Amino acid sequence: AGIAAKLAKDREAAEGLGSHERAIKYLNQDYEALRNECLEAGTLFQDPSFPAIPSALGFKELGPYSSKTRGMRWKRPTEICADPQFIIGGATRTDICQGALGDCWLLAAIASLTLNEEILARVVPLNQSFQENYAGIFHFQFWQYGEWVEVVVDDRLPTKDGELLFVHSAEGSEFWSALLEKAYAKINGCYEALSGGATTEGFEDFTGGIAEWYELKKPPPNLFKIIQKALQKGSLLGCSIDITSAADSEAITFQKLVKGHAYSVTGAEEVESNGSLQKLIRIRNPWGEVEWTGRWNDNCPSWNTIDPEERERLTRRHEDGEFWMSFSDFLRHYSRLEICNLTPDTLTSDTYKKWKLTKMDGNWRRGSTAGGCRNYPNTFWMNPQYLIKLEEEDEDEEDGESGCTFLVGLIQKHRRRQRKMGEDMHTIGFGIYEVPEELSGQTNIHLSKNFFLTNRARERSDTFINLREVLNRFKLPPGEYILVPSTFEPNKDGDFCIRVFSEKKADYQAVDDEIEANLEEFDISEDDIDDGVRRLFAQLAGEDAEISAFELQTILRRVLAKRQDIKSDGFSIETCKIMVDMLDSDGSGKLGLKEFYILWTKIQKYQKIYREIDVDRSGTMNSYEMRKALEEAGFKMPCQLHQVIVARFADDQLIIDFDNFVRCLVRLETLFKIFKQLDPENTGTIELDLISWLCFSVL
Amino acid sequence: THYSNIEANESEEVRQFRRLFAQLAGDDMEVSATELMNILNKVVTRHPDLKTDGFGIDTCRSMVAVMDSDTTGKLGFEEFKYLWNNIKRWQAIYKQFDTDRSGTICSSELPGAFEAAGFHLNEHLYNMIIRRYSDESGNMDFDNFISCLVRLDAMFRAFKSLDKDGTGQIQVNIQEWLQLTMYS
Numbered sequence: 001a002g003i004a005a006k007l008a009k010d011r012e013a014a015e016g017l018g019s020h021e022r023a024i025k026y027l028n029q030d031y032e033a034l035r036n037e038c039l040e041a042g043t044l045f046q047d048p049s050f051p052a053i054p055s056a057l058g059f060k061e062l063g064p065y066s067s068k069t070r071g072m073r074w075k076r077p078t079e080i081c082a083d084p085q086f087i088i089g090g091a092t093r094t095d096i097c098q099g100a101l102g103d104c105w106l107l108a109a110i111a112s113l114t115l116n117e118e119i120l121a122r123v124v125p126l127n128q129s130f131q132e133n134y135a136g137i138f139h140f141q142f143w144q145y146g147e148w149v150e151v152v153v154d155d156r157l158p159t160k161d162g163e164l165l166f167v168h169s170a171e172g173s174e175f176w177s178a179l180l181e182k183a184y185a186k187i188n189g190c191y192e193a194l195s196g197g198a199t200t201e202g203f204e205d206f207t208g209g210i211a212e213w214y215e216l217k218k219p220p221p222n223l224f225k226i227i228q229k230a231l232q233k234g235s236l237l238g239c240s241i242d243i244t245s246a247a248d249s250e251a252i253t254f255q256k257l258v259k260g261h262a263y264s265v266t267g268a269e270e271v272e273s274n275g276s277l278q279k280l281i282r283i284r285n286p287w288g289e290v291e292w293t294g295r296w297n298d299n300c301p302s303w304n305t306i307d308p309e310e311r312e313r314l315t316r317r318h319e320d321g322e323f324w325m326s327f328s329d330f331l332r333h334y335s336r337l338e339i340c341n342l343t344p345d346t347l348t349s350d351t352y353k354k355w356k357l358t359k360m361d362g363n364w365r366r367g368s369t370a371g372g373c374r375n376y377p378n379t380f381w382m383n384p385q386y387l388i389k390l391e392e393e394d395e396d397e398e399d400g401e402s403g404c405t406f407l408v409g410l411i412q413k414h415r416r417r418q419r420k421m422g423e424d425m426h427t428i429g430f431g432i433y434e435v436p437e438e439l440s441g442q443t444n445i446h447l448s449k450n451f452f453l454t455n456r457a458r459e460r461s462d463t464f465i466n467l468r469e470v471l472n473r474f475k476l477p478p479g480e481y482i483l484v485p486s487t488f489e490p491n492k493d494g495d496f497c498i499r500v501f502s503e504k505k506a507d508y509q510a511v512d513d514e515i516e517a518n519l520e521e522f523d524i525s526e527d528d529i530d531d532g533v534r535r536l537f538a539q540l541a542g543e544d545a546e547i548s549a550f551e552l553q554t555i556l557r558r559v560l561a562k563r564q565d566i567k568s569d570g571f572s573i574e575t576c577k578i579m580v581d582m583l584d585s586d587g588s589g590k591l592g593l594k595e596f597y598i599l600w601t602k603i604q605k606y607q608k609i610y611r612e613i614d615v616d617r618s619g620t621m622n623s624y625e626m627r628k629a630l631e632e633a634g635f636k637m638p639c640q641l642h643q644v645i646v647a648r649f650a651d652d653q654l655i656i657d658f659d660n661f662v663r664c665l666v667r668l669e670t671l672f673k674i675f676k677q678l679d680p681e682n683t684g685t686i687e688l689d690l691i692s693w694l695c696f697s698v699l
Numbered sequence: 700t701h702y703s704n705i706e707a708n709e710s711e712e713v714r715q716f717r718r719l720f721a722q723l724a725g726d727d728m729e730v731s732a733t734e735l736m737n738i739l740n741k742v743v744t745r746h747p748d749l750k751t752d753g754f755g756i757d758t759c760r761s762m763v764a765v766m767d768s769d770t771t772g773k774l775g776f777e778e779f780k781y782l783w784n785n786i787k788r789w790q791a792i793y794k795q796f797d798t799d800r801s802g803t804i805c806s807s808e809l810p811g812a813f814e815a816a817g818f819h820l821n822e823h824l825y826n827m828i829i830r831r832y833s834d835e836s837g838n839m840d841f842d843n844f845i846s847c848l849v850r851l852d853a854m855f856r857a858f859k860s861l862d863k864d865g866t867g868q869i870q871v872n873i874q875e876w877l878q879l880t881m882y883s
Contacts, residue, residue, distance in 0.1 A: 001766045001778050003878045004857030007871075011861075059703055365771065416775075417726055419700060493771055515873050550835050574757055577831060589830050638874065640770070644882040647772035648764055652731050671880045675873055685870045690858050691821060693869065697854035697880070698827045698847075 003644075018147030020122065020208065020344060026187055029152040031139035044076070044136035045154040050186045052156045058192025059419070068101060072160035077130060080157070080164070081173040084130040086138070088174055090117075092320055093288040096177050099165040101158075103195055106167055108262040109202030110177050111286045112236050112339075115264060118347055119236070123206045124176055138176075140183040143208040145413045146359050146497035153183045158191070166191065188421060196422035199262070200337050201468055203236065209339040210409040210501050212471050216330055224279050224327055225399065226473075227268040227338075229503065234345070234352035235338040237265040239283065242334030252331045253297055262286060265336065267324065274306045281329050284321030296324045340407060340501050355407075358508035359499035360386060362485060362639075364492060367623025367646040367654035369639050372490030373464060374431050374457065379490045379624055381449040384639050386498065387435070387442070388481040389507035402477050406502040408432075410485045411469035413495035421468070427488040428470050429461025430498070435480035446513040446639075447482065464488040482511060491654075512638045517672045519634030520602065524594045533597050545593035549573065549580040552591065552599075560607075567619045568659040575663040579603075581699060582670045606665065609633055610658050621661060623654040633665055635672075667699065702726060704776075712742060712787075713780065720776050728776035732760040735774050739786070743841075749794055750802040751841035758846040764882045765853040782849065789848050792816050793841050803838040816848055850883055 009017070016022045027049045038045050050056055052074035054064040062068055077084035094114045096107055113120040123141050140151050157178055158165045167181045184205065185191040200211040216239075220226060230237055243260040250256045267282025280296060294300040295316070303312050315324055342357050362384040364370045371383035393403025410430045418424040433455045441447055459474055464487065485498050500508055540555055541547050547555065550573065557563070557570030571579070583595035591599065613629050614621045621629065623646045630637070630645070637645075645668075649660035656664070674696065678686040688696070702721050709717075719738055720728045730738065733756065740753035754762075766778035774782075796812040797804045804812060813820055813828070820828065828851075832843040839847075857879060861869045871879065 001768050001775075001781070002764070002853055002857060003768065003770065003875075003882055004860040006768050007875050007878065008860040008863070055703075055705075059700060061700075363769070416728060419703075419726065495769070515877065549830075572757070573834075581830075587826070587830075637877075640874065641877055641881070643770045644764075644878055647767070647770050648760060648882055650772070652733055668877070668881060671877055672873075675876045684872050686876065687868055687870055689867055690855075691824070693858050694820070694824045694851075694854065695827055697857070697883070698824070698831055698850065 013147070018149075020141065020148050023141050023148035023150035024144075026149050026151045031137060031150065031152050034152060035133065035135045035137045038135035038137065039133055044134075046156075047137075047152065047154040047186075050153065050182075052154075056185070056191055057158060058190050062101065062190075062192035062195070069158070070160075072158050072165060073162075074156040075159050075162075076136060076155040076157065077175045077178075078134075078136075078155075080159075080175070083173050084175060085173045086128050086130060086179075087124070087126065087176045088172070094286050095170040095172065096167060097170050098167055099163065100160075101165040102167050102181075103197065104260065105197055105199045105202065106181060106194065108199040108238065108240075109206055110167060110180060111262070112199075112203065112238055112264070113206055115236060115266075115284075115286070116234070118349070119207065119341070119345060122208075122345070124180055128176075138179050138183070140180055142184060142187055142205055144187070144205070145411055145495075146361060146499065148208070149187065151183045151187050153179060153186055155179055157182065190420075193420050196420045198422065198468075199238065201421060203238075203337065203339040204469070207236070207339050207341065208345065209236070209341040210407060210469075210471070210499060211337050211339045212407060212409075212473055213335070213337040216334055216336060219330070222399070224268060224270070225396070227265060227281065229353075230338045230340060231265070231268055232353055233340065233355060235340045237336065237338035239263050239265055239333045239336040241332055253293070254332045255291070255293060257291075258332065263333070264321075265338075266321075268327075271307055271311060273302050278302070279327035280324050281327050282315075283323040283325060283329075283333075285323075286321065288320050290322060292323050292325065294325075296326060298326055298328075342501075353503070355501040355503065356505050357499060357501060358506060359497055360508070360510055362496050362498065363643065364487060364494045364496070365643040365646065366491040366493055367650050368626070368642045370491045370493060371484075371486050373429065373486060373488045374452065374460070374484075375488065376490055377449060377453060380484070380486065381447060381452055382624060382627065383484050383486040385447055385511040386483045386485075387507070387509040387511045388432070388483060388500065389509075390476065390478045390481070390502070390504075391507075392504040393478050394475070394503055400475075402475050404478050404502065404504060404506070405473065405475045406500055406506060407471070407473045408483065408498070408500055409469050409471050410496060410498045413497070415494060425466045425468060426492050426494050427464040427466045428486070428496070429464035429488065430470070430472070430483050430485040431457045431460035432474070432476075433457050433460075433482050433484075434476070435482060441511060442480075443509045443511055444514050446511065452484070513636045515638060515641065516636035517634055517669070517676075519669070520598075522598050522601075526594065529593075529597050533600060534593065537593060537596065541593075545596065546588060546590035547596060548590040549577040552576045552579060556603075568657050570659075571662065572659050575659055575666070578663045578666045578670070578699065582666050582673075603662070606633075606662055607658070610661055620655050620657055623650050623656060626656060626661075629661070630665070635665075635668060670699075702728075704728070713783075716742075716779065716783065717776065720779070724773075727773075729771075729773035730763075730779070731773055732756060732763045735759045735763060735779075739783075743786070743790060748800065749790065749841065750797065750800040752802065753842070754845065755842050758842055758849075761846055761850050761883060765849060767882075770882060785849065785852065786845055789816055789845055790841070793844055797841075803834065803836075803840040804844065806833070806837040809833075809839055812844075818848065818851055853883065 018024050034045060054069055057069040060066050094111050096111055098107055128138055136155050138153055141148050142151055168178050185194055188194055200213055203211045240262050241258055241260055247258045249258050264284045264286055265281055266284045270279045340355055343354050369382055371379045374380055390404035394405050410428060412426055412428055485496055553571055553573055553576045561569035579599050580591055583591055583598055609632055613625050627642055649656045649664045675686055723734055736754055736756055736759040744753045763774045766774055766782055792815050796808050828847055832847045833839055
């Protein structure tokens, strides 16, 4: 609560929290601590953050009044099977299946983790058993919007009649997929929070990678190469078949099933068949059973038809899920998604190429950074901004000019409104424009309206979809670009993470304004003010020239606002107490005459600035017009700071009147001089004891 | 779907707050500075034994900002319970030092109160809180009293958060400095 918490957390992240190595600990639970504790008291873990109650299953649909979750007992593996194995060796096939209450998509993502030992060990720590130090607690790592969170769970599983209701191995004595699922259910809040979920969602949540999906009845004319660069990049490619209104036909020499069964693409090679050149795609059934006439159709015995054993011996080598159908496969298989793993995914094994990664993080806030689409140029230029830099382009021989490929994924974080996954999603997109030159805005300037106004995009966002992550694989020539992430319509609060997978290095910065402050150099005096304020002011001061903050108020109200209260007339006392603190360099609480004319003048330089913006004797300023009002006021700031100003002085109608605009500028000018003075050597930081912090923290 | 978050150990007050929260935000269960204001200016204003005119907008804003971690300008539901607990608590101490109901507390009477509210400030902090919060005379009404104490306690928590190792000291760049001081 409060930024000292988030700043503190931002420091930790910067030091390494949220990283696979230092996964964030969900609900402050400590797997070792909790296990150790139970290890000691000779007992079993009963998770206090995820009771074996109905609320874990759901909210009356898989909830507490409903039959589905009635009379079912939470049994641990201890009771379920004889030799409860968590996991087992190499494990050829995969016999994982849903229960009468699980979800189809679930088995797809979970099963996809069995394709790689290295990539499963990342979500599910292998250092776990029911033999040595059981205690009944397991842990898992889930990637949550750019970060890893470690989750703890007790092995209690929902069973009705005595069988697992959710995911489980049909044969075995293994229960890591059962508990991997309960764990993912817990971090989503409800087991029923998993419904509505998408395997692309689980892939990334179980990977850290970026899953790009493609509709197969209208794929890219470069999908084969796409499939090839991924396969040699250890990417987890997954294709599926659609079930459209009882769709279960053959369609061509293609069998007879049109079942929505998830398959994987482990191979893709282009081969010369009698001089024709056949692009083949090797599919693999994650569960094993083959069932596909031919071996590779099209007059099938094409493994002898001008295809030497010098490549025939390569094919049909493996075991389990052995297909190899022609790319013309497009007949069947309605879909394909590949999780393009991140750099560290592979235990540095030189085995597969690696993607280059550079994720960021941002916010959209109403009245400041919630810019909106390129559709709304008034506010658009107010969304956070970034810099993509491309220099080294791709490698293959020749294919469609350009060079540098970058897969951009923009993802939106959760916000107490999405009861499930897939719901209450903001419509998100992003726009790419190329840096026309700017060495100034190279990273230390925030592009205004004018730039996106005189600048077209290029390929940018293809449409603002309404889902968790919006993708966009590009390939623009070696240069410098600006990504502007946003929703469609303005004023839609939300957090996000914008990552980048490029086949080659790519300098990605966060283009925004530095915290700058530069205005008056009000060198004091007594003379030259011209005996003007001198006369009538000294008259207002009881004796010498001192005027307290409570005096400043009544005095300043006689001047401005003409005296009719409504829409804050004059200056609130907090404002006045602020206007005093900004000039009272002793602690008198009253203002002299020099450090009074200062206030009088700097204030005059605020009315002009407020009305030069608010063209209308309404005494009301909009929010978005602050970045620019603080501009002609001497101060600049990064997006965070603009966000707090609006979140502190703006109305619910996103309005900041003159009074709050003045305390804001005075409160703000004061802290700059405090830090700047505490930091003469310009080290960039200041030291302070609690007392010091207290003297200062109270304005 | 229908509002969840069930404790079974509800309370009278709170749940009416909770019902108000949903009637204005619902599943969001978040309130703004003005919405909050209204929500506090009833369970604090309705008592014929507490002399106050309610919380000022700036007070609620400080109430919203200090409990708001993402800078969305909205007070959470759970963050409200922390605060209101503290409020229903400082109201208590307030009337102890204002037992002659006047809508404020005697100047040199305030120290006992701060020493009582669980805050024993040093020379200057007391000076800081008076300058900043004492009204004209140098007295203090319930509004500043609560606000001061909300902002005070939160600046203890803030420090302790940025001082994990425990050096009784803290270093901040200008970004942080400004966020900490502008969002309070």
